[PDB]
Design a protein around this ligand. Structure first.
Ligand SMILES: OCc1ccnc(NC2CCCCCC2)n1
Length: 149
């Protein structure tokens, strides 16, 4: 898969993160990201995708070493960590055709896994609208503990 780049934007309290909601197969909440273009540097892709999806330009705030990266089904996703963005920031996507809504969420209230269906003696996982975000949550929490305590 083509690598994806984007951002985990946090507010000034470090207790909220900015998620975006897509449509259709992307109908749930996830961090802003997208696919890298040919010859495009990771930081430039992250800023481009984040600005397309949120209308906020991270370019001046990216730190090269501050990111969480996961490989999910052999596609790499790297989200640069951007703390300290005020919650009164006006966010507006560039394309309403891809982004339904943009909201802040409490990090402590977000799930870090989906629930099984062991009460129903059935295999698999119950739907969760944070499914896109979930893989990053525990790594984010651990990262913020290490960097800030
Ligand atoms: O959060 C990690 C992740 C994994 C898989 N898909 C996505 N898609 C995001 C960008 C596209 C438009 C809104 C939905 C979120 N995010």
């Amino acid at each position: 898969g083509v690598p994806t780049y984007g951002a985990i934007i946090l507010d000034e309290t470090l207790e909220n993160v900015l998620l975006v909601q897509g449509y259709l197969a992307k109908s749930g909440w996830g961090f802003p990201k997208g696919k890298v273009n040919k010859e495009e540097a990771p930081h430039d892709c992250a800023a481009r995708e984040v600005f397309e999806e949120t209308g906020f330009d991270i370019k001046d705030y990216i730190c090269k070493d501050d990111y969480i990266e996961l490989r999910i089904n052999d596609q790499l996703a790297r989200l640069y960590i951007i703390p300290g963005i005020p919650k009164d920031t006006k966010f507006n996507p560039k394309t309403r055709r891809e982004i339904r809504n943009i909201e802040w969420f409490s990090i402590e209230k977000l799930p870090c896994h989906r629930n099984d269906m062991t009460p129903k003696s059935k295999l698999g996982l119950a739907p969760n609208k944070f499914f896109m975000a979930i893989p990053f949550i525990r790594p984010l929490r651990d990262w913020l503990s290490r960097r800030f305590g």
